[PDB]
Design a protein that fits this description.
The structure is a homodimer. Chain A is mostly helical. Helix content of chain A is about 70%, strand content about 0%. The first copy, chain A, contains 27 helices and two strands. The structure holds barium ion (15 copies), calcium ion (CA) (4 copies) and sodium ion (NA). The PDB classes it as metal transport, membrane protein.
């Protein structure tokens, strides 16, 4: 029915999904797009996850020519791949990819699909990846790059994050410029200051080297080491450097952060501005579908049925009656009952806030199940799982403390840990059964507990079909399933905002984190591509010592990934950068690390700082509002 | 006159000085307190600055017993002092101190002064310092501590900062507790994870050592080094540590910052709340002094004289007339003209914002000077000093570039640099003469340029009475006097907020910076007191190597000061902490460094972060308001 479809569009305004279609032809397109929305979700999340993982599992590129093949010399650690094996997965993921990327046409138009910049770029990368798999099939430099690109444009959350970044990138570049001025001036004045003195051994290459060292001091990664010769010369040399790390770290780095922060909050305000614009598009489509007379208002006899299927289909407001109309005219004192378009949306959002509790969506009998449903809905069940997890925790600390006491009662406790895993798979089956699959998926705690339970059960099939270190490690870890006991702390009035901010930050920071992860992966294929060596023997043991202890990496794609994590945490990065400089030979190999530090450290991480702060402030405001 | 005194109190409401006196007896007390306010300002800023500097120049304490006396063994660098010389300065500064600390009585009451907690603690430290100087005179553990304490309670700005810190300290302790929970849990799970594997060489002392290492990893100061054995064992060990530095650094450290931020803005809102309360106390004292009939309003014939001495004494509103009263009654259309107490303050603050331009406050003739005054007030003079500083800059880059080209035209340029110093002392004398001393002191640019000029002239007397490296260093540095050319950049619409935020941050961050500096000094007398050694020879060269290259310090009070700066910048701090641990011998010597890191790193520096951000946001808001 029209009114039914309208109520549906209203709960999609409240729940907030986004589609842009404008009709009996819009019904076939609606069936098509919803088809796409359900199955392609899991069967394609899997697909692009695995396809992106084909890049850290791919066969390296310097191993194709000389010399010795597959060794511990230049130190890798992951399984790699062959060409024959690589082609079959490149083809499979490329195929499911293709069918997805051309699917939208079925609910869009032909010239519409082919006029959308999104789909056009998606198919351009589709054909770059396809011609690649054809060449990697007959027998490579920009194959993984379309994997990470095609990944980042396959999840709307990372899409919109990248747009936000684009918006802040300009003013960000401005502050980067003023920053560059600071570094240049400080390098010139530092260098002209230590011109005819001992720190000619650290300002040897003069302004060229002193800008290098003043940059690495700007990141504080060499604070005591870099000016130790000058401190040895004079005591009062320090005055300079403490002046410079003072101004540069507490006066400069901070308001760079402030710049990225303000730019961020502005692009976010923009993003939710357009977001509310889309929700308005949907609710307005709806009321446009109830106002049959184009006058822009809806009747009593027309909104009693609309609120009727709202209260019947989505949420639990009240019941209509004869005092429904008598409360209508009694409330108005006028015999009109007409709601305009801009007040209807207000009604769907008042309903969206107060009345709204999205209800539960079999060829079976409730006969044998209606006891377990109503007794699992009892809070007694919640105290049951709570107490069960408590005793569980004591069990785990005893068993593990018996592998660290090395006594052998650890296995008698271990079997009980397995039977505890059984307890939890019971809780999962009875909970998913007694609430329904979608109502089970609606809460993040139950999503996580679900997938952790399923990792427990694949763990169980594996651990019992395969035959300790095969078991204790694969099962103690899921004590993270007791982590939900931390929600207890929110009952304390001191830590509510802390635990709450964190809890809501574990999802909301995930697109920004996945973004900086993809920047990592791109930089990783770059570094693998251009740093395949290790002059292995001499340039290595002369390059670094303890820093080659740290620098046995960057020659696999995983080694590159975790070395990029080390650069991410900033500690001792100039040994990776410095040693790869005196590995290649010229200075134009430092722009990898300066460019890295500047894209990820001054932009992305200042971004995540800003977002965490904004999340916690939001939290404090909500707690203020509840009272 | 009463009305005159009132207008005075109004401009002190606008300018915002603070006194709390409540009368012909309040006039003698007013003369007294103003006496104190002028001379004690310079002659006492000097005093407590020097007295505080008696602590880094004091004779050390482990040098009093054995063994070898005053050597390079255990490495100091500053002049020290003797007892005979120390006593005379302890006594002098203690004496001017005393006369100040008992001065307030003259404008306060006896039981009032002695009932104020401020003055009572001030005199308690007065007598602790005096009994000290008596003992240091006849022949020590808590002498410098009352120097830094007596310093921090001698400047209201640092006083109020410390109160703000007190206010945020509670909730700060709460987040510190939840943090401690994170570290403990992560240490237990990390340790039970690496229990029967190679990283028994890093989790040797078990939970005790693993909490140590997980703490130092929490500060990221050992990211690649600390888990390199486990990474050598398995590749998938990294997953743990990247998980942990992820959660701990981007999820935990950040919302700790957020906590200190919100607590800060709250205590600041409190502080300016009470501040406005004091300004209200002054303006209300004023209007209380004009409303002679206690009815709470002021007449026309009474506020025409009040606005009259406002416009005549402080600022430049308009002129009274017969159309002053005709504009009064013409504006009101009622023959009343009465202003209440709460609207009078509004009038003094509307005057304070729009009309307000505090005017210029000789037994001489303007005859010969009125040409230089009006031609220096011309902007042509501003373009004169601007161009002069530009050509000056080119001169300095040429001369200095000739000490780095080592050609000997550097001295011919150098004399011209001196004559440039002469140019600027001319600008200073003619500017201070043509604007007046107080109008010269009213702008921070002219305060700074004044004291830098005077350092140039003491430099000139010195450099010409003493006889290169005696000159080039002592004069090139004052090219910072051209630093004001950076104000030019504020004419660009991209960098206005940046340069402006910075410019206003060079003062506003100064009390928080001085605060963290005093925390440094206290920690410094602590460390000197308890770390006088260097088991010098063995425990040193076995303790540290490159880290003893860094650790030739902490055995003088300056060495302690700059080593505390190194700890402040956080880089490689665990070598100071670790080596001083295996110097003393037990683990109870790490609480110096954990306690340090926690008081200054998680509290004070998060504070200065928050304040910088708030300053820049304020700036953006003002630029928004001007349009
Ligand atoms: Ba020289
Ligand atoms: Ba030279
Ligand atoms: Ba070196
Ligand atoms: Ba109409
Ligand atoms: Ba619930
Ligand atoms: Ba609640
Ligand atoms: Ba080292
Ligand atoms: Ba074991
Ligand atoms: Ba063991
Ligand atoms: Ba070690
Ligand atoms: Ba930081
Ligand atoms: Ba009255
Ligand atoms: Ba001016
Ligand atoms: Ba202006
Ligand atoms: Ba850092
Ligand atoms: Ca390929
Ligand atoms: Ca209608
Ligand atoms: Ca003494
Ligand atoms: Ca009156
Ligand atoms: Na470091």
């Amino acid at each position: 029915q029209k009114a039914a479809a309208l109520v549906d569009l209203a709960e999609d305004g409240i729940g907030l999904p986004v589609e842009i279609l404008d009709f009996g032809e819009s019904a076939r397109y609606y069936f098509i797009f919803t088809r796409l929305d359900l199955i392609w979700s899991l069967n394609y999340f899997a697909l692009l996850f695995l396809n992106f993982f084909e890049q850290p599992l791919w066969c390296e590129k310097n191993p194709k020519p000389s010399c010795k093949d597959r060794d511990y010399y230049y130190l890798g650690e992951l399984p790699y791949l062959t060409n024959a094996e690589s082609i079959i997965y490149e083809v499979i993921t490329l195929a499911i990819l293709l069918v997805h990327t051309f699917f939208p046409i079925s609910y869009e138009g032909s010239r519409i699909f082919w006029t959308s910049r999104l789909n056009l770029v998606k198919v351009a990368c589709v054909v770059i990846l396809f011609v690649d798999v054809l060449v990697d099939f007959l027998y490579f430099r920009i194959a993984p790059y379309v994997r990470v690109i095609i990944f980042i444009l396959s999840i709307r959350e990372l899409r919109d994050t990248l747009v936000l970044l684009s918006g802040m990138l300009g003013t960000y570049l401005n502050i980067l410029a003023l920053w560059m001025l600071f570094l240049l001036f400080a390098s010139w004045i530092a260098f002209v200051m230590f011109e005819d003195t001992q720190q000619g051994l650290t300002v040897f290459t003069s302004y060229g080297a002193t800008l290098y060292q003043m940059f690495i001091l700007f990141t504080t990664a060499n604070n005591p080491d870099v000016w130790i010769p000058a401190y040895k010369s004079s005591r009062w040399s320090s005055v300079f450097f403490v002046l410079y790390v003072l101004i540069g770290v507490y006066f400069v780095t901070n308001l760079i952060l402030a710049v990225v922060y303000d730019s961020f909050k502005e692009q976010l305000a923009k993003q939710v501005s357009g977001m509310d614009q889309m929700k308005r598009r949907m609710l307005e489509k709806a009321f446009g579908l109830i106002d049959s007379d184009k006058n822009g208002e809806i009747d009593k006899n027309q909104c009693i049925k609309l609120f009727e299927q709202l209260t019947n289909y989505r949420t639990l407001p009240k019941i209509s009656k004869e005092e429904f109309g008598l409360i209508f005219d009694e409330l108005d004192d006028t015999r009109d009952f007409k709601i305009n378009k801009d007040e209807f949306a207000d009604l769907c959002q008042a309903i969206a806030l107060r009345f709204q509790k999205e209800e539960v969506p079999q060829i079976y009998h409730s006969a044998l199940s209606q006891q377990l449903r109503a007794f699992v809905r009892s809070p007694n069940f919640g105290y049951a799982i709570s107490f069960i997890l408590i005793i569980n925790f004591i069990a785990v600390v005893v068993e593990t403390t018996l592998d660290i006491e090395e006594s052998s009662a650890q296995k008698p406790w271990q079997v009980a840990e397995f039977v505890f895993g059984w307890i939890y798979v019971l809780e999962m089956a009875l909970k998913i059964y007694t609430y329904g699959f979608e109502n089970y998926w609606r809460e993040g705690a139950n999503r996580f507990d679900f997938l952790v339970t399923w990792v427990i059960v694949i763990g169980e099939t594996a651990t019992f079909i395969t035959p300790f270190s095969n078991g204790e490690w694969i099962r103690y870890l899921l004590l993270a399933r007791m982590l939900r006991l931390i929600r207890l702390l929110m009952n304390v009035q001191r830590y509510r905002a802390f635990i709450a901010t964190f809890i809501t930050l574990i999802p909301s920071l995930m697109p920004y984190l996945g973004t900086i992860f993809c920047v990592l992966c791109i930089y990783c294929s770059i570094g693998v591509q251009v740093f395949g060596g290790l002059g292995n023997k001499k340039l290595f043991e002369t390059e670094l010592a303890e820093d080659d202890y740290l620098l046995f990496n960057f020659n696999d794609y995983p080694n590159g990934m975790v070395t990029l994590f080390n650069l991410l945490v900033v500690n001792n990065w100039q040994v990776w950068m410095e040693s790869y400089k005196d590995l290649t030979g010229t200075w134009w190999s430092i722009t990898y690390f300066v460019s890295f530090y500047v894209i990820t450290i001054l932009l992305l991480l200042n971004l995540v700082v800003a977002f965490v702060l904004e999340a916690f402030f939001t939290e404090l405001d909500l707690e203020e509002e509840e009272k």
